[model samples]
Target: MIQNFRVYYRDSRDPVWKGPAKLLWKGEGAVVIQDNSDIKVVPRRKAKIIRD
Candidate 1:
């Protein structure tokens, strides 16, 4: 099945590493994709987050 993913792109980041402009006070339907994808949140841990 083809998933209709919400479209996004890497815009910008702060010196402290947070993607300041990527946050949202809303939800992406059932996905609720808050775009606060800082490198810290997605640290270079194991590729699969479930393993963490």
Candidate 2:
């Protein structure tokens, strides 16, 4: 199964206290979750594998 959720943040790292997510960049030099900010966008530390 696949779950697609959109969570926004000013930072790229996810906290241990929070759930992990997969991020993808959008059109141009823009992050789908953010816009016009100079924040250094990085991908998730690792990929998520959902198990039933």
Candidate 3:
């Protein structure tokens, strides 16, 4: 089975971790994450991946 993971992004102004969303895809310099029906692509440098 495929492992599930979470993605946390840091705010530029606040500089705090902002998300614990479900990670969908990760490639190159970006990562795709989903929160409910909302999906977003964040930079690889700013996104932290945590496996669960």
Candidate 4:
């Protein structure tokens, strides 16, 4: 599937990021993705999140 949203890239499940991550894109393929955060109340996407 294809979508547009902010995406975060992390190495481990440490719950923290090293630096800014690549944002929303036209296509897909990566390590992680943010589902929600302070900026997000409730949705399928938000801050630095990764796909499972």
TM-score of each: 0.14, 0.19, 0.76, 0.22
Name the best candidate (by TM-score).
3
Residue 15 Cα positional deviation in candidate 1, in Å, after optimal superposition: 11
**Quick one: ranking by lDDT, best first?**
3, 4, 2, 1
Winner by TM-score between candidate 3 and candidate 1:
3
TM-score of 3: 0.76
Candidate 3 per-residue lDDT over residues 1-52, each given as its tens digit: 3377777897679878895888878679988887668887779998888887
lDDT of 2 at 6: 45
Q: Which stretches of candidate 2 lie over 4 Å from their true place?
A: 1-21, 34-52
Over 1-52, each residue of candidate 2 has an lDDT whose tens digit, in order, gives 2246544343436543223334345444443333244334533332222232
Q: Show the lowest summed lDDT stretch of 10 residues, model 4.
A: 38-47
Better of 1 and 4 by TM-score: 4
lDDT of 4 by residue, 1-52 (tens): 5354445434346646444443433234333433444221222232355333
Which sections of candidate 4 miss by over 4 Å?
A: 1-11, 26-46, 49-52
lDDT of each: 0.26, 0.37, 0.80, 0.38
Give residue 14's lDDT in candidate 1 (0 to 100).
Answer: 30
Task: Please identify which of the two predictions, 3 or 4, would achieve the higher TM-score against the true structure.
Answer: 3
Ranking by TM-score: 3, 4, 2, 1
